[PDB]
Design a protein around this ligand. Structure first.
Ligand SMILES: O=C(O)/C=C/c1ccccc1O
Ligand SMILES: [Hg+2]
Ligand SMILES: [Zn+2]
Length: 257
């Protein structure tokens, strides 16, 4: 089935999932000289104080930190968004090398990694329903670069040993996502898709401008993860990003002047 390799990578996806070549695919390149400041955008509201994580899973392409979304706890609202979008999980995409890893790019620049905090619109009752809707999902995307350690990431770093291979999960309660954020909430926004199959065109992207910095030794542990499951040939989980897709005359708006 789908992967990031030569024979099952992003370039093969269109065969099972024809929407891969659709009209609002992600990720895209953010051209900063083409993005327009948008006066109408209300300020972004990221309310993660009551966030209730449950567990962390290696799903054979990335690791997901999953949250309890059966109440309006961790919620994204405001900005380009109408209503309330409940946090369901976060995950990363990263490279084999620091020069690559992110999915979105800024004026062609690839970051070392990219964080996706996935949220579903609470007027659709559940995640599965929301992804059948064009405004069903909001994703907060945050670029990673290599510099100093992100203290609020180290707890995630620490657990990776125990979820090495496809299918493993460990308990991951009381993680606080607030320590994954950069200082500023300036952002670019456009309508787009999930970046993994089934690539559904259900996403409002909010991509932060200010990257977080993580340490060389933090990203190193990310790259020690396995695509394969226990007792299979070792295939390092690296380069699990989709490249930039055609914008197709979408509009990227900036929250900042
Ligand atoms: O495997 C994934 O990429 C997501 C799995 C998932 C499961 C439950 C809820 C949301 C999800 O993204
Ligand atoms: Hg959709
Ligand atoms: Zn993602």
């Amino acid at each position: 089935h789908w992967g990031y390799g030569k024979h099952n990578g992003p370039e093969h996806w269109h065969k099972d999932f024809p929407i891969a070549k659709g009209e609002r695919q992600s990720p895209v390149d953010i051209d900063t000289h083409t993005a327009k400041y948008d006066p109408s955008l209300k300020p972004l509201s990221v309310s993660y104080d009551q966030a209730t994580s449950l567990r962390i899973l290696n799903n054979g392409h990335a690791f997901n930190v999953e949250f309890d979304d059966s109440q309006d706890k961790a919620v994204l609202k405001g900005g380009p968004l109408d209503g309330t979008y409940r946090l369901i999980q976060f995950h990363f995409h990263w490279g084999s090398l620091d020069g690559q890893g992110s999915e979105h790019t800024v004026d062609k620049k690839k970051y070392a990694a990219e964080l996706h905090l996935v949220h579903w619109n609470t007027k659709y009752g559940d995640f599965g329903k929301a992804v059948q809707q064009p405004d069903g999902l909001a994703v907060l995307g945050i670029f990673l670069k290599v510099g100093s350690a992100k203290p609020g990431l180290q707890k995630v770093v620490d657990v990776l040993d125990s979820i090495k291979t496809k299918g493993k999960s460990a308990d991951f309660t009381n993680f606080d996502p607030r320590g994954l954020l950069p200082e500023s909430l300036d952002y670019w926004t456009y309508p787009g898709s999930l970046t993994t199959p089934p690539l559904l065109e259900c996403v409002t992207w909010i991509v932060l401008k200010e990257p977080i910095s993580v340490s060389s030794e933090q990203v190193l542990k990310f790259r020690k993860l396995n695509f394969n499951g226990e007792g299979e040939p070792e295939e390092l989980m690296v380069d699990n990003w989709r490249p930039a897709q055609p914008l197709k005359n979408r509009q990227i708006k900036a929250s900042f002047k």
